[PDB]
Amino acid sequence: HTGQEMIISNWHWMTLQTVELSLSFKMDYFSVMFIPVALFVTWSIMEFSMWYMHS
Amino acid sequence: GAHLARRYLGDASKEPDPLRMPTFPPDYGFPERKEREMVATQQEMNDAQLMLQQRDYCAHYLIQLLKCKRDSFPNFLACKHEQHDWDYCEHLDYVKRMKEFERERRLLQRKKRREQREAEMARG
Amino acid sequence: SDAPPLTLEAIKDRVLYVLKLYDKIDPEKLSVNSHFMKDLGLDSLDQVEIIMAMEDEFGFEIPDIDAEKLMCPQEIVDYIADKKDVYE
Amino acid sequence: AFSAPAAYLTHQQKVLRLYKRALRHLESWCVHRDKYRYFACLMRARFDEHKNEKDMVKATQLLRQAEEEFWYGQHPQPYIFPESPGGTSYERYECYKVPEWCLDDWHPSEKAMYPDYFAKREQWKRLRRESWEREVKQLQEETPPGGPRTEALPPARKEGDLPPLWWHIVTRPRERPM
Amino acid sequence: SGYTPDEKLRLQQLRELRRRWLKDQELSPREPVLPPRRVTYRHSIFAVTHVLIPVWIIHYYLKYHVTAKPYTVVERKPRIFPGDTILETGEVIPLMKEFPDQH
Amino acid sequence: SFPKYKPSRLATLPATLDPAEYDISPETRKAQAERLAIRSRLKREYLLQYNDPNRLGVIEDPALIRWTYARSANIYPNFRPTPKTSLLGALFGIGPLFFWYYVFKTDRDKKEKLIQEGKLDQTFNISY
Amino acid sequence: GGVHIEPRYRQFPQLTRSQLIQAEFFSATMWFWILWRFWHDSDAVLGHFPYPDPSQWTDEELGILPDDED
Amino acid sequence: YLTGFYSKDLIIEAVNMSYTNAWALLMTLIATSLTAAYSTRIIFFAFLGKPRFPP
Amino acid sequence: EHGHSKMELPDYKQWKIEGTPLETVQEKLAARGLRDPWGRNEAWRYSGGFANNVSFVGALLKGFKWGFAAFVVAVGAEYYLESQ
Amino acid sequence: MLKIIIPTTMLLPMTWMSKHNMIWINATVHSLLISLISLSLLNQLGENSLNFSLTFFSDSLSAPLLVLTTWLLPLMLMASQSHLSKETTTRKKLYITMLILLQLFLIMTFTATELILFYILFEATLVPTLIIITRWGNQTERLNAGLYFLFYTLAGSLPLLVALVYIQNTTGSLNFLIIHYWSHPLSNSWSNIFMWLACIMAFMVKMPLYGLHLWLPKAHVEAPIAGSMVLAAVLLKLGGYGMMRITTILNPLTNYMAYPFLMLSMWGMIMTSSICLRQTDLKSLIAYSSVSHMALVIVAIMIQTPWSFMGATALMIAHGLTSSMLFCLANTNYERVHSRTMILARGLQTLLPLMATWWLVASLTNLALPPSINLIGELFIITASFSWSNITIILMGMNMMITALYSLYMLITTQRGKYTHHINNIKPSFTRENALMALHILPLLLLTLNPKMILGPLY
Ligand SMILES: CCCCCCCCCCCCCCCCC[C@@H](O)O[C@H](CO[C@H](O)CCCCCCCCCCCCCCC)COP(=O)(O)OCC[N+](C)(C)C
Ligand SMILES: CCCCCCCCCCCCCCCCC[C@@H](O)O[C@H](CO[C@H](O)CCCCCCCCCCCCCCC)COP(=O)(O)OCC[N+](C)(C)C
């Protein structure tokens, strides 16, 4: 709808002099588009495996 | 494509290469030399932040299409008139680029003919 | 899987079914204790052919050192049951 | 697997094994059934034309160019049964075969369940305990001096006797324990 | 070729013993003994204890701890087109220069 | 005729194509019989030690102990300094060290010289 | 979860009507979607703009002078 | 007008008219031809002939 | 709940080479003077519901009839509704 | 710091006056309490140090090693509890006394504000180790291993004493603070070159450097379990700590004097990683893996950049924990098998699942899997060496690939596959071994949450 774009750096892991390493998530177009596709495929695969490997 | 076969099987200097074009001055053809017009300013193109490769002479229709797509969101196929206009203008730009290529080819042809005629006249 | 637990009389029925369609031997004369080399006059190559026929039809393959010493349907049934661990 | 091997293979054994391998690879080449039957009959025809040869020198000269012909057209990707030593499920269930002696290490709380099974297990253990003491003497008195010449074991001869070295063979995890 | 009599006898006896053992592997109806001792609705509670609570915790953590520090959450500025109006200021963006429109 | 199969180190000759067992003599049969005899003797000993109900341990295998001792603890006493061994040791233990030293020395000299002359563009190279 | 289907041993397996009708319905849905999309839009498949021929373009608009002026 | 069309067709068109290596063009075209070929092989060998599985 | 119903095997007289493409194999074997002993063993692969096969093209357009009918109905409805 | 040293000393009268059947409980409980007390040293400051007195001082480099040393003793006692079941009370008390003395010497060594005291204790840590290896060793090669371990160390360390007394005579003080503040450049001369060699080789032989590592496989194979853990975990880090301490006076000689050792280490990592592939023994494989990791640490220390030092400290801690866990697992396997050979026992995952899980976790940690501190140190050293020269990446990547290969090979050979048929004494794993593995592994996955505690003074 909008084209919302966002990166979240919640937890600051450690600082090495002038470098900062923090737990940063990028929620760009690629990520926000690939999360639902991967989740849908995994859901279908898990439902199929509930039958394939019952034994 | 036939042009590639012509260049790699005929004479290389007969027709140009995409890397070095254009090789002749713009005013060689006709002296009026009309200037291309751009209807989208720097600031509004920056505000729309299209792309670096999308900021060409066809930008106004792209901005209109983006405005439509943002406005009528739930109906994802709501407007196609501005989409068709954007493709039509892109097709026109491609036509102009092909015009540049053919103009360069024919001008190089005429230059080669002139050089051959001058050499023959000097020899004769 | 849903594989039914195949049993000895089912195995014997399968062996007799495969053998009875082997036209080189008459179904009436054959018996589950009948031999191959003497009681039916079958060649060694023919015996290899029946061994491969059971191989194809049962879905499991018998090693050569064990296949060449099977001469009766009863011992074929016994070998298959031993391989597939059949109770009754 | 069950039968003990001999020191060498006779000429008939080699011929039969070559015939089986050739038919298998021919079936692999000809996917459909009718083609397989036709060419298998042709192969049998070309195979039995030298059945009645007498001299072993020429027969050994044969089955040598035959092996080369087989190796030239051996279908580099043959069909292998799923449980065969080359199949897709060769050793699939080998991670489920738990040895029987593991049950000797179970906690008494775990042995509280399945009590009749463990009673039968104790009965089997006593049977093995007596049978082993009989089998060692039987095997000692039956084997020839200088050590056995082949790995073939004799059966039980008396009434109460049991076949020597039967514990490993008799009890197994299963073909498909889980 | 074929089985030797000793081989046949040994195989028969081994087969009998193997079948006896395999039959002994069965379970009686009472064999598994379990000692008992204790100390839309399904989806309704699932969406409550698995979706709603993580949403609450994440929202609290993000909105009063993450954004308290500067630049932790930075969002791409929304695209501005000719014709829209800004909520913060109320000014209107001037439109285009009426490009010639044919086809 | 058919193209021949040429065996190599990593693709050995198949048993069927091998001609050793097609030249059959009585001494070959005797050799095969003796091989089967010793193999069956070892198998019988292993099976006797294997089915014993009284045994509650690991069957000590002399071959495994012999292999481990030969691989690990019996190398030096059988070692002799010979031109082949000395040359191989010198090469494989000295050549790589000097080769890598030369490579890194030239690379670092080139970088250090570029640092002196100043055309390296070390901008933003803060961490080191 | 399903119904009880028994083996056949050299006969055709039992087929429930549900899977047959579902498969036929989904194949029909795919073909209907293909036909509808193609009918609605023929441009994606064949192009929506003619390709100009560069030979027909006259020398006037390309600024070619007849080998004498310059 | 299937799911794979909207990606693969545009991939082929974009590859066809860019200043790229010609050998890559040829290999891509042969690769998609072989893709169709092996899909045909799967369908033909798994769904067309007479049954060949155990009885 | 498992598959325990005591399945009965069919009779062995049912399977005949007749009506199958094994006739060509048998005739070409008899022309050179042989026969296939295992000819009947695979007759079941051509006897029952497996007798009728579908061509690759015919398999491809599995549901053209229903889809075409639905497409024609939809186009007619759209034509008669938009023309208003 | 006497609040740590005094209880360690009191551990001896405690264990000697304890009952015959309660020595292990008392020793374990009070050593865990000592570790809890020693946890307070981790609170360092960005300034100089925690100068306790004129004799002991604590930095943020000595604090992690001190904590690891104090934490290792309970695991040593829990591991040694198995094979000492049939041992008399006096000899068990002597073993515990030797372990306590080793801990006390290491604790006094790691702070040691003066260099001569550091050398005295860093050579004193050699007697209890030799006694443990030579006395409570199973194989008949323990005597040769003890002789090798003693002499390889002492030959390197003897010139260090002469170098230290010469430095005291010229400079005038061997206190570390005065050394650091009054440091002056060493001119390029033969005498200074030999001073550098004398000061460096003593620590390089102990890590060890490739070419001087012959003592480590023998000492690790022949020693008992506790000796193996104390060798792989702490006693190797003595060389690294010593060199990071002493290299403050060898500049700028070190820039051009590090080339032979750098090349030796960067090729010996590959050589020992390859050696790990074709190994018929387990403890030898873990020993060679330790040699490879210590070669990487040597490279990091010789590079002499802040990231090199941080990665070196992290790698030392991580490798100590991982090697101790691996030696523990190998010892538990050997106790049941009684053979110590990789391919004799196979497919143990089907029989002992939880031990297979511990094997998998230990292999993953040794494999330098992110975000464990193993990979933190590894990657820091990789980046520092890349800054040193862009061609080091080839050797480092080859080492990483071979490390993964041999780790997964060790896991697969002993866990996957079909079980050996003729082994029927694989009793289920006790609670002691599972607790030992858990106490080995949980600190690693806890330290991966707070890396700054083990990143050294240059953080
Ligand atoms: C709700 C709370 C959540 C967090 C809880 C945190 C729990 C922390 C407890 C663990 C402590 C870690 C060990 C660190 C102790 C070392 C510090 C020690 O040296 O300090 C001493 C003092 O420490 C305490 O007095 C005693 C610490 C020992 C007790 C630890 C608490 C838990 C131990 C329980 C063990 C056994 C439990 C029961 C077994 C059955 C003396 O220092 P001092 O040089 O004078 O200080 C001078 C400054 N003054 C003047 C302001 C005082
Ligand atoms: C085997 C397992 C590992 C053991 C440890 C190995 C590490 C120790 C090896 C020693 C490292 C280098 C030592 C000296 C480096 C200085 C550079 C010098 O060697 O090169 C030239 C020196 O030329 C010659 O090399 C002179 C020395 C030659 C004699 C030394 C023996 C060489 C081979 C012996 C190797 C044996 C090592 C193992 C002993 C057991 C430079 O010429 P120059 O610029 O003018 O002099 C520099 C010094 N100045 C500036 C103070 C004047």
Ligand SMILES: CCCCCCCC/C=C\CCCCCCCC(=O)O[C@H](COC(=O)CCCCCCC/C=C/CCCCCCCC)COP(=O)(O)OCCN
């Ligand atoms: C596992 C085995 C490792 C073996 C390690 C042993 C070798 C270590 C290197 C040599 C150690 C001895 C060095 C001497 C101690 C340092 C003291 C010092 O530096 O003082 C120098 C003195 O330097 C020396 O005297 C050095 C002489 C060395 C003699 C002994 C030689 C031993 C072997 C040396 C060659 C091997 C070196 C590499 C060994 C590699 C490992 C095998 C200054 O002299 P001044 O009198 O003050 O002069 C000032 C006025 N001009």
Ligand SMILES: CCCCCCCCCCCC(=O)SCCNC(=O)CCNC(=O)[C@H](O)C(C)(C)COP(=O)(O)O
């Ligand atoms: C696609 C790959 C094709 C590969 C083709 C391989 C080559 C095919 C042609 C092989 C040529 C030969 O037959 S090589 C001929 C080898 N020599 C003999 O056959 C002589 C005597 N044969 C016997 O005695 C046997 O036992 C026998 C009578 C056969 C059976 O006997 P039984 O049954 O009573 O036991």
